[PDB]
Amino acid sequence: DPVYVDIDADSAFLKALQRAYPMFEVEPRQVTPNDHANARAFSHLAIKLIEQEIDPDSTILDIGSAPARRMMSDRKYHCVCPMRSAEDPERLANYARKLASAAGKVLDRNISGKIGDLQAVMAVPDTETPTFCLHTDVSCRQRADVAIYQDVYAVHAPTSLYHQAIKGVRLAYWVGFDTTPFMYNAMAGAYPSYSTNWADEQVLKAKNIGLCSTDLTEGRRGRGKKLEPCDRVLFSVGSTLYPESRKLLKSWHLPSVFHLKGKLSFTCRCDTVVSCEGYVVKRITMSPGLYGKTTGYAVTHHADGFLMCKTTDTVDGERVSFSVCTYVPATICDQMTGILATEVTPEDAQKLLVGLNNTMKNYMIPVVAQAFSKWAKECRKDMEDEKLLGVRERAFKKQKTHTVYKRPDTQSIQKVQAEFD
Amino acid sequence: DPVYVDIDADSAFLKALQRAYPMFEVEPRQVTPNDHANARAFSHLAIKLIEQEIDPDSTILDIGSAPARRMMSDRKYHCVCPMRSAEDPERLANYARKLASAAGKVLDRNISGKIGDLQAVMAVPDTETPTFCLHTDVSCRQRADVAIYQDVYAVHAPTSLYHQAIKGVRLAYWVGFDTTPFMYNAMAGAYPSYSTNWADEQVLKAKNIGLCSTDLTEGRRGRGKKLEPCDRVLFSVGSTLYPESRKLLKSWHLPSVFHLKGKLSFTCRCDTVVSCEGYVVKRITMSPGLYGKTTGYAVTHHADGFLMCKTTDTVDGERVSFSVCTYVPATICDQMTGILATEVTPEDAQKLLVGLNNTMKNYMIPVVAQAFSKWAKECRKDMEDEKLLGVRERAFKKQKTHTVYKRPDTQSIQKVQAEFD
Amino acid sequence: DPVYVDIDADSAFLKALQRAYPMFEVEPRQVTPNDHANARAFSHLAIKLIEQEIDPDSTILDIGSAPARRMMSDRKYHCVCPMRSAEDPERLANYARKLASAAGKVLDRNISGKIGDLQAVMAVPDTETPTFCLHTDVSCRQRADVAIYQDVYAVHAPTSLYHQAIKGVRLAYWVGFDTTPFMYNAMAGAYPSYSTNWADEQVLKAKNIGLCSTDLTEGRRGRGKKLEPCDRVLFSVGSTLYPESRKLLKSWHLPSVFHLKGKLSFTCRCDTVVSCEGYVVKRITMSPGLYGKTTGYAVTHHADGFLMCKTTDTVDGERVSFSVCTYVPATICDQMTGILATEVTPEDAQKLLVGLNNTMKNYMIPVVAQAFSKWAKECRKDMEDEKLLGVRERAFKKQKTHTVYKRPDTQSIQKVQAEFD
Ligand SMILES: Nc1ncnc2c1ncn2[C@H]1[C@H](O)[C@H](O)[C@@H](CCO)[C@H]1F
Ligand SMILES: Nc1ncnc2c1ncn2[C@H]1[C@H](O)[C@H](O)[C@@H](CCO)[C@H]1F
Ligand SMILES: Nc1ncnc2c1ncn2[C@H]1[C@H](O)[C@H](O)[C@@H](CCO)[C@H]1F
Ligand SMILES: [Zn+2]
Ligand SMILES: [Zn+2]
Ligand SMILES: [Zn+2]
């Protein structure tokens, strides 16, 4: 009955897992000293929840899979395993090793069939076996009714979803990182509960962000003028590095209702079912035919505080300014309500935050204090420039905005595309 | 005997549930981590109350129903299920699945008849079966005596009620959100006990309201003049989005006595039986014949504090002012009586509110403090401009009103339409 | 033996109920969450007292009755049920259903006779059956000796009483609200122990009275001169609305002795037997013949404090002043004796009242404090303008009066009509 996860006994993330999954029993059982082990415990319970809420005796597609994970299970998967990354060959060899190491020791599974299918694929590399193939997502012809995505970021969501819509798939799941920081178009950020930092390529030589490296210098006295976000972004999960693109990340921020109308037509809905400090599980349902109208709005609910603030740093010796975003626990946000009524200095806020705090990591405190200090001043400036009801005075002047703060129990709303052809 | 609801064990809404339903035993039994789970516990007890106060062996219509909810019951429903929203095909598929999954396992119900009726409707899509149809509310011809509305907002109340009265229906129920904030014509608002925020479309790019998103900017130096509420409004319940219209929302704020006089004539009454921090249950009775006179007044009783105040914000860079409304618990209102005798500053009120408060959510405190501070000053200004009894001095000057505060144990009264033809 | 009433266990009105009815033992038994449930508990024991003090084997008329209340009793009633209100058909339908639901289950009653009488009335709608009719109070010809009025406000008392005087009735009862506030000609008022507020029609758009609604505004720079009470008044009991007229309310404030002399002559007396914070029971005795002389004075005894004060408010943007009346508990009045010796400001009075107070509802405190502060100043002004014994100095000047305060153990006396022809 209890589910064993690879976390230390006295870890504060266990209660977060409890609140996120209040239908399983969780017990810590540490084996290896993995430095990014919190993500595995979430993706570990996510698949169990999906299987516990899916109908039995159904065929399940798997886009970009590792077949060793789906070998000791009891459902009929079909693994789509192309060779496009440098880390695939050892995955295939590992699958082969564990297939050979249980030839007759385990018989409750379909090991013999899997071995035969793998040998058939090795023989002719164009066959479509029940449980394995060497195609991409838009070329596999194995018909099914369920599709699952796990840490898949390099596919374009509309085209991918449309290419399983025409194959009898009526339900899809997507587990991954929150897409919200890239809808706000920030330059760098962190997911401090999973030891993950991401940064744009043009700020890799900064000084005081979570992913950078600089040098010592004395200061020289010897065109650009445009410092704006670009497509290429670098992710660091623990010590593992992943390059990503902004367009494909943004393409998965789907509205509540949309239409896929090419040759065959479908009406699709997107809902968020599980959310934990950066990880989200999204369920998508599809049905043929053009049903009612679409608005084009995407909504995000905030259970914790979300901050995005301006900061000044030194990149390769040159002083510049750009935006950084982060997550803040709800308890600290609730306990900071009284102080933010007045105007406070960044160092006083820093001392107060250190006094209250460990609940949050210490390397993010100095920027949170500055964001709070700048927010409290803009609130006061808004309060002292009262206007009249229902009238605008006008060319009209615009004001400064250096902080965006989303408190818990609030919602963000953005305009996106809803008509895909 | 105890009713099991999907809420956490230590939830403060439980005692409010008892205060609202003092005829059932309530026990918390958490299953899923739903972020808007408080609505289900209210709509869950409401149906039991309706059934426990309705005569047995009666046929019940259901406008805009989900047949899966009324499958394991023991009363004769008739579900009107048109296909007008994108989420209807999944409801029909789920109904089919739960009908097929209990073919012979359960026999206490009318499962065989329901399956046969569904197959008959699938055969000819114009039939009128005892328990199911594919018609609109004004086109179904199944005669009955009771009608129920659940979270129905897109119908015009007089026409819908008139098309139900000519079919033998003498009693109707309506469960939903309070219509009072739209009678005051507010711009945005919240229902903080159910994690719901609503806003007008023209203020979606604000900064500090509960449903908005903005950007960072420096400030540019580069017609409108009319900022007034419009028809289209957006609702967010947890993370689910609903577009609504102001006219159809206001159409359900019915007076105590009204007349429906077309070809046949009816006299109708409207009464409120259950109210809980935003949810209301309304009972409507109808009788043939034009009986006595009508006044045209609608009355709302306040068990908790209601506030509507002016505020200044920045929308898309431009500084503007508009009105926001909210609900306040009764205990805080009672404990703030002494302080409001004198003139107080917003920050002192903020600190006092933080000291007393969690009972209320923290993101609404700063606007409540400002509303209280502005109300206390207008009271003092009224006290120092004493007039004479029974005489008006006159063109007459109007005064400023920036806050409307309805304390508990008070009533609001509005003028509405009472003659419908 | 115990009388079960629908109130919460820990309610302060219970001890007042015992103080008012020290011949019954009362136990609270909550079933429904009625928001105006206190008046039902008073009207419930009122009928018990009336029946326990009336001779057995007597016929009782019932003016404007609901026959469902008098169905499971053991005395011979005769219900006068005209069809003048929009809520009467539902009462008749409920009576029919309750008669049909006990055809043979209960036989201790006269159910068969009642059913037969109802069927006979439905057959010919001019018959006069022992227990039912479709006439008014001045058209029923069923002779009796006792009449009862319950929450009847739309009849003119002299004509009504005369039309049962000529029919052998020698004793009548009247249960309802206190008529005293309308003899003082106030503009608005409250009955805070029963969650009831009433207002004149010309002040429905005020701001801080208990029954009003206003809007937000900025203030414009753009005949009347007469703001006086009018006939039409609106009552709100919980959330139920009732319109009444001032004349018919005042007509029930009867003197201690009066004469009804038309064709036959009668001498009548009026006495108050039960009084509780706004609800009164009046007993009227009638006798043939013109007996001794009349004075024409009506007296009211105050067991609690009664206040009437001037106040300044804003109606539809215009600043005006008018009078408001209310009831105050005796304990607070007794504990305020020491403070009122000197001249006090409204702020100090408000703070003291909050300190002593919950015993009284918080929304009425600010006007009570102002009334006390204004009364204390007029007392001192009277004290410092001493006159000579038995001499008036005179045209004579009039002084200001802004507060009327009737302390407990005092009596009000008014001049009314006593000769009715
Ligand atoms: N067009 C594609 N169709 C299917 N799978 C694809 C595609 N491109 C890359 N992949 C896989 C890669 O081989 C990685 O292994 C997987 C990363 C998840 O862990 C996944 F991204
Ligand atoms: N004119 C209509 N007559 C009957 N039902 C209608 C109508 N319009 C929409 N609906 C239904 C929709 O299909 C949604 O499912 C229901 C929402 C409640 O949950 C309900 F609104
Ligand atoms: N002239 C009348 N003679 C007798 N009854 C009358 C008369 N006018 C109205 N009524 C009744 C109405 O029908 C309401 O039901 C009753 C309200 C008390 O609850 C009562 F007011
Ligand atoms: Zn394949
Ligand atoms: Zn139908
Ligand atoms: Zn009669």
From Swiss-Prot, chains A, B, C:
- This chain belongs to the protein called mRNA-capping enzyme nsP1
Tell me what organism the protein belongs to: Chikungunya virus (strain S27-African prototype)
The superkingdom listed in its UniProt entry is Viruses
Give the comment on domains.
Answer: The N-terminus binds a zinc ion which stabilizes this region. The C-terminus is disordered.
Question: What processing steps or modifications follow its translation?
Answer: Palmitoylated by host palmitoyltransferases ZDHHC2 and ZDHHC19. Palmitoylation is increased by the interacton with host STING1.
Q: How does it sit in the membrane?
A: Lipid-anchor
Cite the binding residues for Zn(2+).
Answer: 78, 128, 133, 140
Region: Membrane-binding and oligomerization; residue ranges are 289-421
Active site annotation, chain numbering: 36
Q: How is the subunit organization of this protein annotated in UniProt?
A: Homododecamer. The enzyme forms a membrane-associated dodecameric ring with a central channel for the exchange of between the viral replication factories and the host cytoplasm. Interacts with non-structural protein 3. Interacts with RNA-directed RNA polymerase nsP4. Interacts with protease nsP2. Interacts with itself. Interacts with host STING1; this interaction results in inhibition of cGAS-STING signaling and increased levels of palmitoylation and protein stabilization of nsP1. Interacts with host TMEM45B; this interaction leads to viral replication inhibition.
Subcellular localization: Host cytoplasmic vesicle membrane; Host cell membrane; Host cell projection, Host filopodium
The protein's site described by Involved in the phosphoramide link with 7-methyl-GMP is found at 36
Q: Where is the Alphavirus-like MT domain?
A: 27-253
Summarizing the function annotation, the protein's role is: Cytoplasmic capping enzyme that catalyzes two virus-specific reactions: methyltransferase and guanylyltransferase. mRNA-capping is necessary since all viral RNAs are synthesized in the cytoplasm, and host capping enzymes are restricted to the nucleus. The enzymatic reaction involves a covalent link between 7-methyl-GMP and nsP1, whereas eukaryotic capping enzymes form a covalent complex only with GMP.
